[PDB]
Amino acid sequence: EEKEILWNEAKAFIAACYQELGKAAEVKDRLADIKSEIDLTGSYVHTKEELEHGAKMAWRNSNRCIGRLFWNSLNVIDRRDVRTKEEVRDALFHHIETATNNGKIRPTITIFPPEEKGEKQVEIWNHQLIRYAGYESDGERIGDPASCSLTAACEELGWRGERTDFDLLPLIFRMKGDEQPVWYELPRSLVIEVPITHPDIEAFSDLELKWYGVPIISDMKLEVGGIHYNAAPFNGWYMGTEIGARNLADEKRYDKLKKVASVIGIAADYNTDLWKDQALVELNKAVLHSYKKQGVSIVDHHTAASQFKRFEEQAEEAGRKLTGDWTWLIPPISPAATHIFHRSYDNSIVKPNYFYQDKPYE
Amino acid sequence: EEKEILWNEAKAFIAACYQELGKAAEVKDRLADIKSEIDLTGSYVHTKEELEHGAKMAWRNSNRCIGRLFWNSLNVIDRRDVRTKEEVRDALFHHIETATNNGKIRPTITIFPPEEKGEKQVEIWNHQLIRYAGYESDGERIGDPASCSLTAACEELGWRGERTDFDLLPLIFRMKGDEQPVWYELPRSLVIEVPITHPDIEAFSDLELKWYGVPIISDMKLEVGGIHYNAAPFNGWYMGTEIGARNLADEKRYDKLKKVASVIGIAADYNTDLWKDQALVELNKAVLHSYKKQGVSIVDHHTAASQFKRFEEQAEEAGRKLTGDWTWLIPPISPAATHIFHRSYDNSIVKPNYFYQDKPYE
Numbered sequence: 001e002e003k004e005i006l007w008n009e010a011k012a013f014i015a016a017c018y019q020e021l022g023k024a025a026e027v028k029d030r031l032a033d034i035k036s037e038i039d040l041t042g043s044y045v046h047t048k049e050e051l052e053h054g055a056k057m058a059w060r061n062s063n064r065c066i067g068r069l070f071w072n073s074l075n076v077i078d079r080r081d082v083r084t085k086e087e088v089r090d091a092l093f094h095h096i097e098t099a100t101n102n103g104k105i106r107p108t109i110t111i112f113p114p115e116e117k118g119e120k121q122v123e124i125w126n127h128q129l130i131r132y133a134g135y136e137s138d139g140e141r142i143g144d145p146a147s148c149s150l151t152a153a154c155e156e157l158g159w160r161g162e163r164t165d166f167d168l169l170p171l172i173f174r175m176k177g178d179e180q181p182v183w184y185e186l187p188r189s190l191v192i193e194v195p196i197t198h199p200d201i202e203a204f205s206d207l208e209l210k211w212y213g214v215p216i217i218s219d220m221k222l223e224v225g226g227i228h229y230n231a232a233p234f235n236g237w238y239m240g241t242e243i244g245a246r247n248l249a250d251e252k253r254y255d256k257l258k259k260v261a262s263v264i265g266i267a268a269d270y271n272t273d274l275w276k277d278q279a280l281v282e283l284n285k286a287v288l289h290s291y292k293k294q295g296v297s298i299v300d301h302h303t304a305a306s307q308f309k310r311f312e313e314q315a316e317e318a319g320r321k322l323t324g325d326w327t328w329l330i331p332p333i334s335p336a337a338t339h340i341f342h343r344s345y346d347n348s349i350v351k352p353n354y355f356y357q358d359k360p361y362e
Numbered sequence: 363e364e365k366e367i368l369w370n371e372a373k374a375f376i377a378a379c380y381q382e383l384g385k386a387a388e389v390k391d392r393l394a395d396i397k398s399e400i401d402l403t404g405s406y407v408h409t410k411e412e413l414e415h416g417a418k419m420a421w422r423n424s425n426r427c428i429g430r431l432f433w434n435s436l437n438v439i440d441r442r443d444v445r446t447k448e449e450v451r452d453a454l455f456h457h458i459e460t461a462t463n464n465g466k467i468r469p470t471i472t473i474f475p476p477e478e479k480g481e482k483q484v485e486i487w488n489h490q491l492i493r494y495a496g497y498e499s500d501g502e503r504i505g506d507p508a509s510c511s512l513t514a515a516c517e518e519l520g521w522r523g524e525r526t527d528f529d530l531l532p533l534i535f536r537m538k539g540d541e542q543p544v545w546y547e548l549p550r551s552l553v554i555e556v557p558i559t560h561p562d563i564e565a566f567s568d569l570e571l572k573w574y575g576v577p578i579i580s581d582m583k584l585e586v587g588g589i590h591y592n593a594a595p596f597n598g599w600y601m602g603t604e605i606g607a608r609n610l611a612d613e614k615r616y617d618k619l620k621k622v623a624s625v626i627g628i629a630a631d632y633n634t635d636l637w638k639d640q641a642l643v644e645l646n647k648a649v650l651h652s653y654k655k656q657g658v659s660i661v662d663h664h665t666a667a668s669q670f671k672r673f674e675e676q677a678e679e680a681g682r683k684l685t686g687d688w689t690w691l692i693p694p695i696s697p698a699a700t701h702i703f704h705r706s707y708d709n710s711i712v713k714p715n716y717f718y719q720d721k722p723y724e
């Protein structure tokens with residue numbers, strides 16, 4: 001019964017995709033080719049053009065993403081030909097290098113072979129390709145708490161972290177048929193990191209903060225016309241609040257606001273002093289300043305929201321419905337200073353899209 | 363058919379209300395009294411105790427309110443005995459005075475006669491009892507744009523504003539049978555206002571900003587057991603972001619961020635400088651400082667969110683379901699610094715509650 005669902009999704013996807021591509025006349029023959037292929041094989045194989053456009057549609061449909069103005073310029077790398085661990089590893093390394101682009105971040109996705117009959121071909125364990133390890137024992141907190149479970153999984157497989165606050169996790173992924181994942185240390189020459197300084201407050205460097213250049217989300221499933229690409233890591237560039245208001249600020253993450261308050265010279269005693277708010281602003285100013293100073297792409301939430309307004313206008317001009325998730329679109333810093341905060345959005349799910357999938361570990 | 367709906371609402375309300383009040387045994391006889399009363403009269407009349415508790419329940423059920431920890435200490439003033447304009451006006455004046463309480467704001471509601479058969483007895487036109495007028499002609503912007511339509515309505519009735527940025531609108535309300543509302547200037551001796559200064563930046567007073575002490579929301583309908591109290595003005599104290607992040611900051615309100623940036627000495631040129639965020643923080647620090655300096659109650663969003671966490675815990679301990687509206691509960695300043703931002707809430711509507719109703723004017 002698997003193939004009846006697939007056929008329906010493929011009809012809807014091919015019709016819409018060829019329509020947008022001006023190939024509506026070719027729709028008829030391509031679907032017949034598909035229906036034969038499914039009857040014979042149980043599945044079908046996207047053309048390069050369909051795979052590229054489908055990945056772009058999926059970004060355009062991601063309700064939670066403010067960055068969607070640039071959906072059509074996604075650089076799609078087709079790695080459905082991969083068969084071995086070395087090829088997976090090298091394609092992951094290449095993604096890091098080409099997406100980094102010496103700091104001028106190129107929004108990129110690398111697509112690996114899709115699930116066959118819901119059996120995975122490649123299974124990536126990382127949440128992002130570049131991310132810091134986290135440790136918790138004997139009351140000692142080190143690194144990124146969000147990474148505790150994966151870090152413990154990795155250290156069961158014979159990896160061992162230096163237990164700095166910024167250990168790079170290795171790539172870790174499992175191949176079909178294999179029964180433990182392999183892991184590979186990231187070559188440091190491929191990983192750009194940005195030290196956090198402040199434009200005005202020289203003491204800010206006493207915090208010794210840093211973050212990595214490129215967030216490469218490697219654990220979501222791309223669904224295009226009924227085909228499930230569970231391994232399809234992608235990246236944009238950061239919006240600064242993601243680092244300054246969440247990764248470095250959350251009490252469950254690096255929890256740095258009290259130390260930020262101290263180095264910027266304000267007291268952290270009274271809610272009514274709004275010291276957390278003031279610290280959040282200076283930390284977020286430092287993040288943008290540091291990325292720009294180093295020549296690594298980044299966008300602030302005001303410019304990002306302005307770009308998203310253009311996306312909304314572009315949708316309307318193209319007669320496409322806009323969908324969005326207000327609770328994820330508003331930024332966590334001065335949200336009411338953006339137009340997003342002041343309108344509502346239809347949170348309907350349209351496909352192609354990116355979806356969550358269960359982690360292979362605990 | 364009006365009375366069948368009423369009977370159902372009354373059963374649900376009286377059962378729940380007497381239950382909470384430990385009067386469950388009295389439920390039976392009180393409902394029979396109600397069913398006779400509705401058969402005869404078309405409606406029923408709440409006891410003082412039911413009206414007071416029902417107003418308190420309605421606040422407890424207001425999904426959008428972060429201030430609900432204090433729902434049970436609401437001071438309920440029963441003015442169902444009012445019949446004339448002078449009595450309405452004096453009860454509105456008394457509400458201002460007793461709720462203000464020389465600055466130690468007392469959360470208060472004044473309840474006027476309810477709708478009879480959906481015909482209103484008293485119809486308040488003000489959105490808040492104390493609010494500033496707004497004007498727009500010939501490209502000239504004065505006052506509070508949110509008040510433009512009511513201000514124009516008032517000036518049709520023979521009132522005339524001085525056209526400062528902070529003219530107090532008069533009370534305006536209509537009595538049943540009458541065909542134009544009356545209006546009365548507020549006695550300035552009853553209206554506390556707070557000039558906005560900054561704790562550290564003496565130049566902040568050059569902005570000549572002020573706001574009024576007590577927000578007294580006078581245009582929502584209180585519904586208790588099927589009875590519709592359309593005229594039931596109530597007040598809490600302000601949460602500082604309401605003034606500093608919305609009333610004085612919104613581009614459609616007083617739009618003061620560029621002037622705030624100037625007096626605090628930062629440039630307002632580059633999104634990446636986060637000058638809007640920085641200005642928002644200093645303006646909101648000034649609002650809290652000024653209310654506290656003058657001795658007028660106010661709460662900051664951090665303390666408010668801490669209190670709301672206690673409300674959530676109190677609900678759970680009492681076996682009551684919690685409902686809430688996340689998009690209204692998070693504050694517009696540093697929302698992710700509060701626990702609210704990090705959980706979800708059931709937005710179901712339970713009654714008693716406060717509801718929107720159409721304005722009598724345009």
Ligand code: HEM
Nearest residue numbers: 059062064065066067107234235236237238239328329354
């Ligand atoms: C080019 C620069 C980009 C920026 C600045 C950007 C910004 C963001 C931000 C800030 C979020 C999280 C919002 C929040 O935490 O509330 C987000 C979510 C998302 N973005 Fe983007 N994004 C960009 C590129 C991309 C790309 C290239 C894709 C895929 C091709 C993508 C797909 C998504 C998805 C799927 C989510 C939601 C993930 C989830 O539900 O967990 N974005 N984006």
Ligand code: HEM
Nearest residue numbers: 421424426427428429469596597598599600601690691716
């Ligand atoms: C005692 C101090 C109080 C504080 C600090 C407080 C705080 C707030 C705030 C900040 C909002 C708007 C949230 C936003 O803009 O997103 C709000 C909404 C609300 N509050 Fe409270 N509140 C308090 C007292 C009261 C009282 C006494 C009542 C009624 C008895 C009430 C009923 C409501 C209602 C009904 C709304 C939503 C109004 C609407 O939908 O337009 N609150 N509250």
Ligand SMILES: Nc1cccc(CCc2cccc(OCc3ccc4ccc(N)nc4c3)c2)n1
Nearest residue numbers: 215217235236237238239242327328703704705
């Ligand atoms: N309590 C709360 C309220 C609203 C929203 C949220 C989400 C916070 C969060 C947590 C973990 C991840 C995350 O984002 C994932 C993501 C995916 C794709 C991206 C592409 C580009 C980019 N720059 N960022 C991306 C981030 C958000 N939590």
Ligand SMILES: Nc1cccc(CCc2cccc(OCc3ccc4ccc(N)nc4c3)c2)n1
Nearest residue numbers: 341342343577579597598599600601604689690
């Ligand atoms: N785009 C957006 C997103 C989320 C929430 C909002 C609401 C902004 C708003 C507009 C007008 C009024 C308002 O609040 C009304 C209100 C009612 C009762 C109160 C009791 C006490 C108190 N201190 N404040 C109250 C405020 C909120 N807009």
Ligand SMILES: [Cl-]
Nearest residue numbers: 215242243247
């Ligand atoms: Cl991240």
Ligand SMILES: [Cl-]
Nearest residue numbers: 577604605609
């Ligand atoms: Cl207000």
